Structure formats: C-alpha cells, structure tokens
Amino acid sequence: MDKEEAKANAAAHEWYVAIDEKQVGPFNVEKVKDLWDRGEVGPDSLCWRSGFSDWIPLSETAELASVLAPRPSKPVIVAPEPVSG
C-alpha cells in the first residue's frame, strides 16, 4: 500500500452509532460514507461521538446529508404526530 488508513485525516473520524439499541464500533466519515450509501448503517438510528452529550438520529440532522450522500427512494407517509418535541 502507498497510502494511510489510520494516519489519514479523511478517515481520522471517530463516532459511534445506536444500532439495535446497542453501541457500535468507531466509524469514520470515509467508512460510513460507504455504509450509509448502501444502507449498512442506521440512517434513522441515533448517532454518537467523542464528546456527545446526547443521542440524535441522522434523519433529523441535515449536517449528515452533506457528508453522507442520500439515496432517492419512493414517497413515504409518516404519522401525524412528531417523534421529538
């Protein structure tokens, strides 16, 4: 190999995710980007990180969209009452 995986900055991100009510291993923007792309991670599940005080779903924060390219899917309907608020 002529590159870095742990020393690289593009993949020097460490943040866990709430999956199946169980905490997952440390992921990176370079790793998740591939998972979320195919739907390997939890888009609607809460996401944590070093320093995070609480848990928040990626489907609520748009800051995760600019990083994780979303996938176009058919239209879906949701309940009248919100989940948070």
Side-chain angles (χ1 to χ4, degrees), residues 15 36 43 45-47 52 56-68:
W15 52 305
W36 148 291
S45 251
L46 312 329
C47 130
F52 228 138
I56 185 185
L58 291 68
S59 206
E60 276 31 81
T61 187
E63 78 208 343
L64 226 314
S66 290
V67 178
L68 274 50

Side-chain angles (χ1 to χ4, degrees), residues 3 6-7 10 18 21-22 25-27 32-34 43 61-62 64 66 76-77 79:
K3 236 67 157 96
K7 315 295 275 198
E21 203 81 22
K22 308 307 206 285
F27 282 127
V32 166
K33 58 91 95 276
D34 245 41
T61 187
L64 226 314
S66 290
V76 188
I77 60 164

